[PDB]
């Protein structure tokens, strides 16, 4: 898949992703906060189509992610991220995609997600998060 790396910013304002209830997560794009103004991250699109778009609009900076969780699993021979859930201090968004495979979860007691990197081919292959205080 094509690797991407957004880098670290001052917070997150909005997450736009797309999924398919049979396969996995497809498109991924973030609107970050950069010192009080939105910074539109580059769109990281799947190599194919047919996904259902989702827009996760956060009331920044009062609302911020306190936990990211999801499932990784095999899709057509590839281990990919089949599902993602974003929990804030205000609400829970997801799960999006298929909740089967091996679960993972990152509850944050102190700190903030300020950035994402990973890889998307047909589906999201993997992904990492930047953390800071």
């Amino acid at each position: 898949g094509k690797a991407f790396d957004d880098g670290a910013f001052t917070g997150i304002r909005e997450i736009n992703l797309s999924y398919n209830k049979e396969t996995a997560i497809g498109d991924f794009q973030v609107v970050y906060d950069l010192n009080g103004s939105p910074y539109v991250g580059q769109n990281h699109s799947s190599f194919i189509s047919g996904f259902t778009p989702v827009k996760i609009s956060l009331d920044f900076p009062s609302e911020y992610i306190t936990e990211v969780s999801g499932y990784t699993g095999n899709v057509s021979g590839y281990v990919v991220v089949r599902s993602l859930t974003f929990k804030t201090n205000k609400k829970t968004y997801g799960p999006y995609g298929v909740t089967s495979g091996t679960p993972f979860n990152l509850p944050i007691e102190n700190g903030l997600i300020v950035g994402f990197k990973g890889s998307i081919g047909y589906w999201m292959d993997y992904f990492s998060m930047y953390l800071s205080l």
Binding site: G70, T72, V80, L106, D125, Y126, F127, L131, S132
Partner: peptide, 15 residues
Amino acid sequence: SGKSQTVIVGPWGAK
């Protein structure tokens, strides 16, 4: 180096 760094956790997914 002249680039700041941050904690990074992951990746989850393909190896």
